[PDB]
Amino acid sequence: PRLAAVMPDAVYALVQGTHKLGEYAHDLVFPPTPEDLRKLEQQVNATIPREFDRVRQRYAEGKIANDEQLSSELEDASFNWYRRQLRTSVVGATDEELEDVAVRKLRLEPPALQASL
Amino acid sequence: AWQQSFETYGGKLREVLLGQQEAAKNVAKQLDEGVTYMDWTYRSTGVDLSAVWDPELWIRFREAVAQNEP
Amino acid sequence: VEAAYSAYLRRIAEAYLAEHPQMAAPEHAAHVARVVRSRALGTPLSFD
């Protein structure tokens, strides 16, 4: 049944299954820290866009949903973030004109080295 | 049935592996660098597997399963 | 070729001093030499 689709699924199954087996066997010989499981949670917490915070707290206080009212809630924040990204890519960010986009995509300005030391 | 014995093997080998922590990271380095380029194969088995082996594909496999990105 | 090099230095020099009439004063006569010697070879680089 359309092997041209089965082969990527086969390699994907292999990769993901090997990763899961590895993490399993790795947190057995080394049990995970009972507190830095919160630290990795904080690390992934620091990476979420802002368009989702208006939903996030709403999930803590019950208000949010049953199970699907949520799944259609995340789509709105998602598409808001998506259209913001389209705008930033094409016409620029929130605080930069067209010249700043030109110097961004021409790589005229080095990463600031003097400041970081 | 492998899970029941695997539970007893886990804690049994965990301390034995946590003890050394230096040989355990020397043998792992040697084993990985030796499976990457299979250049030990001629002197040990007679078949020179380094002619058909692709180190880049193995390195990419390793990094893919390390990052979970097929 | 020495005449040409001198006229090249000349062009750079009067161009720069017309650019910056402020330190075009003779006080920076040795400073403007430091800047013209730099501008006559290539562009100066910052650290970054």
From TrEMBL, chain A:
The modification Phosphoserine is found at residues 71-72. The modification Phosphothreonine is found at residue 94. It comes from the Eukaryota. This is Uncharacterized protein. It comes from Chlamydomonas reinhardtii (Chlamydomonas smithii). The chain holds residues 14 to 130 of 324 of the full protein.
